[PDB]
Design a binder for this molecule. Structure first.
Ligand code: MG
Ligand code: ZN
Ligand code: ZN
Ligand code: ZN
Ligand code: ZN
Lengths: 299, 122, 166, 56, 151, 181, 96, 63
């Protein structure tokens, strides 16, 4: 009965949520096809949004004029690091100890920093000083209080690749590459009590959700197809790059599951990492802008 | 949810409820749209006419009396007994068949003795 | 025992082909996929598909080695088996939770059935939609149904949960 | 009880909108007058029943 | 035009307005039934609309002497550049502005153009006349002295 | 079985009845919002008994009407699971029988009536048992037990109740009496 | 058929007077206003269904009281852009 | 303008925001009560007339 907007609480979408708020799994990498009867089973109106003079939708009829678009999802075969959180992921990874889940601080030290969190609960500027001191103090240590210190290697960064200068033979310092699956399985161990001691929340923003497992698809209404002269359908940038995602995705599942020449997995993995980075931000750093065959960069 | 909060609820027998509907029926009686009671309300009235085994006031007296007979007889179960009007031990069996506790023949007869009054004699 | 249970789960996924894969890597302690294929006689593609599943369950490890003459990489696999009695639980905890959820559903649920050798056990929601005839075969719909197995499935799962409820 | 300028404007504004949708008018007779001008004469006689809840 | 929402005391006036049609000066352009569909008074007849009007409707009459209207010079530097005025209607094609109100707009008269917008909803209209009218702004908030005065 | 509810809600009183004491006034407005509606938690709201107390009015920017916090009494009907009810057979079908137990109807299928082989008399509208020659038709008084509730829509005509009588002491009242010896 | 615009400077002048009511009418109401049904304990925009005539939010199934919320069509599209990324814009409404 | 306000009160200032904007996505709220947030959403601003609340008893015999 006619309420108004009280507040807004930002956070991070969880994989669990994305599956219920999705209307259908997009699977057919194609656009319209062609000049008559434009109805497919993947990215276009598969209970997603209506734009043509055909009334079909998700049971509600509701013609293209005044019809809020519905979201979709894509079940990604492998985990994928989100580029936007990269810098923060570094602060998490090299400040805690692996296998335990502790913040590499004794209980006593942990206990007293709690009292600086209620006295500062409104001023965003002066809390950033206090987070970084914990950050800086944890980075210069090697003695966890719950694994007996077994010599903790140091992490690397920049732009999205990670390493750890370990020892394995007698004194070597090879650079073992890091895979998103590896990283993800290491963050789910960090208990919920420790997230306030970092820069996170226990319910709204879990750290493990930063590694994209399901990509939500924008609706049809937000992806319009502009026409050039009078018969040409100059497809939308969003649509093309999404189509590009499914074309590499579809070969990906079929190429690892059947034959396994191992080499393909290395090349294919980083390309997907490369490709998703452009979808989030085409003007990213260190990433060749994936343009359409005309020279015009995709926005 | 009905409203913000539910603050109080009470269990009512079918016989006593008939009067409230009849009172509500007597209102409206407003003639301007004539205001007929809607279908499901009209249906409930007819159903109420046939199953009222007791007088409105004497049902209250038994309802209070059944609550004070045993601690394990709450208001809903006692109100249900007034709606069914059990005649002997067999009716008590089928009502309490799916319940937590099954009354023994001894403790049932104490209840029966209370229900031995008020019986319509018809 | 400790050797035995690690061989049983891979048999549940791959089979006898996967039992030899786990037997082969424990023998050599560092191996490529070609070295594991020759010791058992299985093709190297069939061997390697089994190892990607154990990689996905956190039970197989590998560190890349640069071939200095050809410039390529070939993997040296090892084992990491410090997660054994918990994945035995942490699968079977939520899988018995899935078996909890089914038994809790079976109380207030499916009551009808078609009288054929196929398509029984209809819900009451579908029942009123069908208007008491079958749309699959056409037989007259019958009633209260599967009462023995909802007693039997109640008596199949409750004793499996006492073992793992500890 | 003397109103502030902002409270005065609001009261008139609220009262005027009620006068459009029904809500009987007091003695405000002359000749054809807009709903706004109706609220002005009623307020000039101090008969507006709307009281300002003061936050204190 | 402004919507008026006929109630009971201006019923007589509005009946004449909608009957006058869209051409003469004291006329009307639209009529809005309680359902919300706007009916345009143009096409071929306006008699059958101006029958029993039935209170609760809404007529959009032309601007008459006395409706509140704002006025803007555009660039809106100080606070005083938008002020509410009272409409008076005369034949020709320029806005007539009284001379002492031409320090606050910082206007001259060699072709400078001004715009005027008309608020509609009854709460908004009332609010404009009580709080922004010219007479409440003879003294300027910048310094303690009069701003609207003799030139 | 019925229930009496004392619930406080918020009522929007239109200005069109602004010259009338709030208790009667809010009562009419509130009444055309709840009658005829199935609230999934509690059930069929039959009728508003009365309005006990109503608070002061508050105006909100934009609407122009007046919001009040009222207190009223409601009469509801809840068919909770496995609750024993009594009703009257008001409809005959070749596959079941609709039994009005109140504001709604309760369907009991022919396979859950009695411990006996029941056949449908085609020429008439009745069920006849094989072994016992007991016949059940229109207008009979029965006693049954709720076995399932299907709460779909808010419309009373779209939710359906499932019951059964296949227990000792159920069925037509005349059968029960003949079986007691 | 166009005149001049009401951009940056024209909002700040009306605020100075204190005309809240006049402001809203001028800058938004002369566009489209779309009414959407928000879930109370979830925060995610619900979903209709014609032919049956009912609302339904994703996580909680009909039991939870969903409420109407009136907002500018421009702002609804802005939420979607955040929603297309991994950001969740939970709209926590508050009573009259 | 660079210091603390609400998150939306820096969204329409110096578009670069994709490093500082994602910062707020980790544990933060917002109620309202600015000026530009309320004008973007359609609510009455808290200055001016908006800061007054009315109340009125409803017998009203006209007389
Ligand atoms: Mg000039
Ligand atoms: Zn739709
Ligand atoms: Zn440790
Ligand atoms: Zn069958
Ligand atoms: Zn919800």
């Amino acid at each position: 009965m006619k309420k108004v907007i009280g507040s807004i609480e930002f956070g991070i979408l969880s994989p669990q949520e994305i599956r219920k708020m999705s209307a259908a799994e997009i699977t057919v990498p194609d656009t319209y096809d062609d000049d008559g009867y434009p109805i497919e089973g993947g990215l276009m109106d598969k209970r997603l949004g209506v734009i043509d003079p055909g009334l079909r939708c998700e049971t509600c009829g509701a013609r293209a004029g005044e019809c809020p678009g519905h979201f979709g999802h894509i079940e990604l075969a492998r985990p994928v690091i989100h580029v936007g959180f990269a810098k923060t992921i570094h602060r998490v990874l090299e400040s805690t100890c692996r296998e335990c889940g502790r913040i590499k601080l004794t209980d006593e030290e942990i206990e007293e920093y709690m009292q600086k969190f209620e006295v500062m609960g409104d001023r965003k500027g002066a809390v950033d000083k206090l987070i970084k001191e914990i950050h800086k103090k944890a980075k210069e240590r090697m003695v966890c209080p719950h694994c007996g210190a077994p010599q903790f290697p140091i992490k690397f960064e920049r732009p999205t690749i990670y390493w750890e200068l370990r020892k394995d033979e007698e004194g070597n310092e090879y650079k073992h590459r890091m895979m998103p699956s590896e990283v993800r399985d290491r963050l789910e161990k960090i208990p919920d009590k420790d997230l306030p001691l970092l820069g996170l929340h226990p319910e709204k923003s879990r750290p493990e959700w930063m590694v994209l497992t399901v990509l939500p698809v924008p609706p049809v209404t937000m992806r319009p197809s502009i026409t050039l002269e009078s018969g040409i359908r100059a497809e939308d940038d969003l649509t093309h790059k999404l189509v590009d995602i499914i074309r590499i995705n579809n070969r990906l599942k079929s190429n690892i599951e059947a034959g396994a020449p191992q080499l393909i997995i290395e090349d294919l993995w980083d390309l997907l990492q490369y490709h998703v980075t452009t979808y989030i931000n085409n003007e990213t750093s260190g990433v060749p802008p994936a343009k359409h065959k005309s020279g015009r960069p995709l926005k | 949810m009905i409203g913000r909060k539910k603050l109080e609820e009470h269990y009512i027998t079918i016989a006593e409820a008939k009067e409230l509907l009849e009172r509500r029926h007597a209102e409206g009686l407003a003639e301007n749209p004539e205001e007929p009671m809607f279908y499901e309300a009209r249906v409930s009235l007819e159903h109420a006419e046939r199953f009222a085994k007791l007088k409105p006031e004497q049902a209250r007296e038994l309802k209070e009396k059944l609550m004070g007979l045993f601690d394990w007889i709450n208001e809903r179960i006692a109100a249900k007994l007034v709606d069914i009007l059990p005649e002997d031990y067999l009716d008590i069996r089928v009502i309490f068949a799916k319940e937590e506790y099954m009354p023994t023949p001894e403790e049932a007869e104490e209840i029966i003795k209370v229900i031995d009054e008020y019986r319509p004699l018809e | 025992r400790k050797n035995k249970e690690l061989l049983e789960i891979a048999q549940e996924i791959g089979g006898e082909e996967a039992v030899e894969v786990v037997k082969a890597l424990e023998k050599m302690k560092e191996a490529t996929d070609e070295e594991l294929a020759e010791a058992t006689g299985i093709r190297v593609n069939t061997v390697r598909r089994i190892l990607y599943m154990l990689n996905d369950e956190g039970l197989a490890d590998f560190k890349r080695i640069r071939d200095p003459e050809t410039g390529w990489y070939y993997y040296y696999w090892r084992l990491e088996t410090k997660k054994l009695p918990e994945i035995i639980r942490s699968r079977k905890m939520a899988e018995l939770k899935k078996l909890k959820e089914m038994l809790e559903e079976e109380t207030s649920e499916i009551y009808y059935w078609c009288g054929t050798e196929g398509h029984p056990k209809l819900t009451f929601d579908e029942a009123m939609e069908y208007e008491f005839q079958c749309p699959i075969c056409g037989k007259m719909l019958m009633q209260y149904d599967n009462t023995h197995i909802i007693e039997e499935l109640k008596r199949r799962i409750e004793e499996l949960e006492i073992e793992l409820g500890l | 009880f003397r109103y502030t300028r902002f409270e005065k404007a609001r009261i008139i504004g609220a009262r005027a909108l009620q006068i459009a949708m029904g809500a009987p008018v007091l003695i405000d007779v002359p000749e054809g007058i807009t709903p706004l001008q109706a609220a002005l004469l009623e307020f000039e006689k101090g008969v507006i029943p709307i009281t300002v809840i003061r936050p204190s | 035009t402004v919507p008026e929402k006929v109630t009971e005391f201006n019923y007589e006036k509005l009946k004449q307005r909608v009957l006058n049609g869209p051409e003469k000066y004291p006329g009307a352009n639209y009529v809005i039934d309680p359902e919300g569909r706007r009916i345009r008074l143009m096409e071929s007849n306006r008699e059958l609309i101006a029958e029993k009007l039935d209170i609760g409707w809404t007529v959009e009459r032309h601007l008459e002497d006395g409706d509140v209207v704002l006025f803007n010079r555009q660039p809106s530097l100080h606070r005083m550049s938008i002020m509410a005025h009272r409409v008076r209607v005369m034949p020709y094609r320029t806005f007539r502005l009284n001379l002492p109100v031409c320090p606050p707009y910082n206007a001259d008269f060699d072709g400078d153009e001004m715009n005027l917008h008309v608020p509609q909803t009854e709460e908004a209209q009332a609010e404009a006349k009580i709080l922004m009218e010219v007479q409440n702004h003879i003294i300027s908030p910048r310094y303690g002295g009069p701003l609207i005065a003799g030139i | 079985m019925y229930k009496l509810l004392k619930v406080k809600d918020v009522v929007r009183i239109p200005p069109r009845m602004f010259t009338m004491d709030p208790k009667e006034a809010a009562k009419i407005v509130l009444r055309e919002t709840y009658e005829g509606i199935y609230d999934r938690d509690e059930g069929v709201v039959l009728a508003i008994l009365d309005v006990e107390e109503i608070s002061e009015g508050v105006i909100v920017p934009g609407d122009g009407a007046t919001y009040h916090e009222a207190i009223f009494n409601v009469l509801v009907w809840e068919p909770r699971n496995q609750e024993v009810v009594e009703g009257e057979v008001v409809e005959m079908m070749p596959y079941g029988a609709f039994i009005r137990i109140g504001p709604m109807d309760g369907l009991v299928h022919i396979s859950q009536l009695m411990d006996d082989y029941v056949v449908f008399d085609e020429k008439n509208r009745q069920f006849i048992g094989k072994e016992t020659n007991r016949v059940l038709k229109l207008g009979d008084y029965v006693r049954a037990r709720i076995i399932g509730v299907s709460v779909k829509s808010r419309v009373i005509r779209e939710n359906k109740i499932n019951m059964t009588m296949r227990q000792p002491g159920l069925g037509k009242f005349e059968w029960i009496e003949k079986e007691k010896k | 058929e166009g005149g001049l615009r009401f951009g940056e400077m024209e909002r700040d002048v009306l605020i100075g007077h204190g005309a809240a009511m006049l402001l809203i009418e001028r800058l938004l109401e002369e566009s489209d206003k779309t009414e959407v049904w928000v879930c109370e304990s979830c925060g995610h925009l619900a979903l209709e269904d014609k032919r049956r005539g009912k609302v339904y939010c994703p996580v909680c199934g009909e039991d939870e009281r969903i409420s109407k919320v009136e907002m500018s069509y421009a702002f609804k599209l802005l939420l979607d852009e955040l929603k297309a990324m991994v950001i969740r814009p939970s709209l926590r409404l508050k009573d009259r | 303008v660079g210091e603390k306000a609400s998150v939306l009160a820096r969204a329409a200032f110096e578009i670069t925001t994709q490093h500082l904007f994602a910062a707020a996505e980790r544990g933060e709220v917002d109620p309202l009560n600015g000026v530009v947030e309320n004008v973007l959403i359609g609510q009455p601003v808290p200055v001016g007339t908006g800061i007054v609340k009315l109340a009125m008893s409803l017998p009203l015999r006209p007389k």
